[PDB]
């Protein structure tokens, strides 16, 4: 009769060995039905993207004896140990790894009859795709780019991209490396002005799945580069962030705001940590600083998985029954899995609980189908600051539950539309004239900017032997300014 | 001890040992220093997208004793047996299974000690990227629909998806499914015919 658990890590093991040891330190402790007798767990750790490691770490433990599981892994680990859930019916609760800045993208799972897997999406997955149909629906895009960082996997929201391209519609997609700044050493070379110009407006509707602190450098860097006003609508997508991190992103962002994350079900946290007798630390329970400000998966996978270990040891132990691990050699292919793991599935896999996101099950189609996002836009005050309020709210049963300019004049000199109102030396400053009127009707009754050349030939520019135009015509030919107002007597 | 090595053999696996033990006693015919000599093979027929199969075959090789490890099997059965070769110090040839139809893109390698990391990759990365940056270019279209089947691994365009992001180009991007009969009434029967007609020019 042991009570042995176990632990097999990759990657940034270190906050999964701390989360892990949180999970059975009060385990002991303020579990009711295991109190005070011991829980014990080896935790191993293996290299990122190892599952070779993860094998010698699950079958030795087997040897070893072990009873329940609390694990993360990533992508290419996973899928080896789902053909083994087939080959071998290991019960396993299951979250991908996310790389950060962007959220996780869904690793690709082998062909089984579902209900039997190493992976079963407790993570709420990809759904973001009629949250992408809300801005096309109100704002009414027709150009977009999304900007993921260097580590994100484009598979997943694929389901917006092909509709939509069947819409007849227009799209960029970009990858961005993690110097941001260097990003823009980057662009600003490749870019010129006029390029910067139709690109800050093909920025006037961003999309965002980036690294944090170089997303907020990057707002800087936009505000900075002047890409940005009270008309450029952002996009923010990561799951992978906390409540004062929002605020934090909202400093320098001073135009139209939107961040996505997975926002539960609206309740009060506070006196939920007082749970079936337990002392569930949480929020305000267990504050801890320099933890909470930063998001993790861990911390969601704390609070369900152990309260799911709570469950367990209230069912499957009163049900009359006892499970622990008879084992088979791995390195051999004659050993059929042992009898009692269907019990033991039930312990882990198919039980009922109801936690922070809703009610948490697994059925023989071993996903999660259900997803409830909270959509929120801008709010414009200088002295409160951006504060994310309630455009509306989604769910993937509905859809959304609501909705949500300087230029180059160019001159030449002209008799009756060029009148010198004031003159100084070498260029002068500014004219008058009739034209001086037909470019302010516009500036007046529309609200935007301008800028003023002036033509280096500015003589009726012509049709050159340089299969070229001169003067004022080829300079938008060359397209090196943006507007001119003159006598132009078109010809095709 | 044994002179052995492995095989795991998907998709057609009748074509794979087919092409796999003739050749194999050709060269044994055809060496020399293996004249006449029995190099012997344990190929596992395998179910389809079940690496794990392949990889219980393996561990039976390391508990038989093999000379290198030759395959034709999936990149999640790419990780597990190198870093399990790494120890024992077998040479890892991994060649990447098959897309379905589609053509290959090359699978990522995993993080692991660089040039100490020897799985011996038989098939090289996708370099088709490099004639679509030209071909876009050569013939000068800027809108145009990129289509595909679901046998494919939509990354394996990420280059020349940023380079068509920064030329301009505005390109659909749709799916096509296996029953082709149908894909004509999910056409029609959803579009309206003159947008229909709009996406037909």
Redesign the interface.
């Known amino acids: 009769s042991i009570i042995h658990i176990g632990a097999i890590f990759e ?1 940034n093991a270190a906050k999964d060995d701390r989360v892990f040891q949180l999970a059975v330190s009060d385990l002991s402790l303020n579990d009711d039905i295991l109190q005070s007798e011991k829980i014990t767990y080896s935790i191993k750790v293996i ?9 010698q770490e699950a079958c030795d433990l087997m040897t070893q004896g072990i009873l329940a599981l609390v694990t993360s892994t990533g992508c ?2 996973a ?3 789902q ?2 859930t ?2 071998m019916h290991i019960p396993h609760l299951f979250v991908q790894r996310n790389p950060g800045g962007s959220p996780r993208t869904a690793c690709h799972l ?2 089984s009859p579902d209900g039997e897997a190493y992976t079963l999406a407790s993570r709420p997955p990809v759904r973001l795709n009629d949250v992408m149909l809300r801005l096309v629906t109100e704002l009414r895009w027709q ?1 977009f ?1 999304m900007f993921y960082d260097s580590e994100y ?3 997943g929201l ?1 389901s917006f ?2 509709q939509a ?2 819409l ?8 961005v490396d993690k110097n941001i700044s260097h990003v823009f050493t980057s662009l600003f070379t ?1 870019m010129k002005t006029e390029e910067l110009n139709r690109y800050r407006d093909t920025l006037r509707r961003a999309i965002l799945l980036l690294s944090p602190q170089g997303a907020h450098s990057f707002i800087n860097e936009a505000v900075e580069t002047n890409l940005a006003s009270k008309d450029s609508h952002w996009v923010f997508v990561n799951e992978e962030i906390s409540d004062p991190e929002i605020l934090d992103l909202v400093h320098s962002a001073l135009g139209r705001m939107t961040v996505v994350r997975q926002i539960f079900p609206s309740a009060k946290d506070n006196q939920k940590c007082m749970r079936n007798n337990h002392r569930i630390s949480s929020l305000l329970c267990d504050p801890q600083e320099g933890y909470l400000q930063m998001l993790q998966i861990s911390n969601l996978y704390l609070y369900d998985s152990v309260l799911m270990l709570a469950n367990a040891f209230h069912r499957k132990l009163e049900d009359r029954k006892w499970h622990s691990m008879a084992s088979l050699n ?4 004659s050993t059929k899995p042992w009898n009692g793991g269907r019990s033991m599935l039930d312990t882990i896999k198919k039980g009922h609980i109801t936690g922070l996101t809703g009610v948490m099950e697994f059925r023989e189609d071993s996903s999660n189908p259900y997803v409830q996002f909270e959509i929120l836009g801008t709010t414009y005050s200088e002295t409160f600051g951006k504060d994310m309020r309630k455009l509306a709210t989604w769910d993937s049963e509905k859809g959304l539950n609501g909705s949500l300019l300087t230029l180059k004049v160019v001159t030449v000199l002209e008799e009756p539309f060029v009148m010198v109102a004031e003159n100084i030396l070498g260029q002068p400053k500014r004219y008058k004239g009739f034209s001086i009127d037909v470019l302010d009707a516009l500036a007046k009754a529309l609200g935007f900017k301008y800028e003023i050349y002036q033509a280096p030939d500015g003589r009726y520019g012509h049709q050159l032997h340089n299969t070229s135009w001169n003067g004022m015509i080829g300079e938008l030919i060359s397209k090196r300014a943006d507007l001119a107002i003159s006598a132009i007597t078109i010809t095709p």
């Open positions: 990657e290299e990122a993207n190892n599952p070779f490691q993860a094998v290419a680990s899928n080896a140990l053909s083994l087939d080959a082998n062909p150009k780019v996997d484009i598979r694929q991209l092909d391209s069947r007849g519609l227009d799209v960029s997609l970009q990858k490749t791995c390195i051999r292919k």
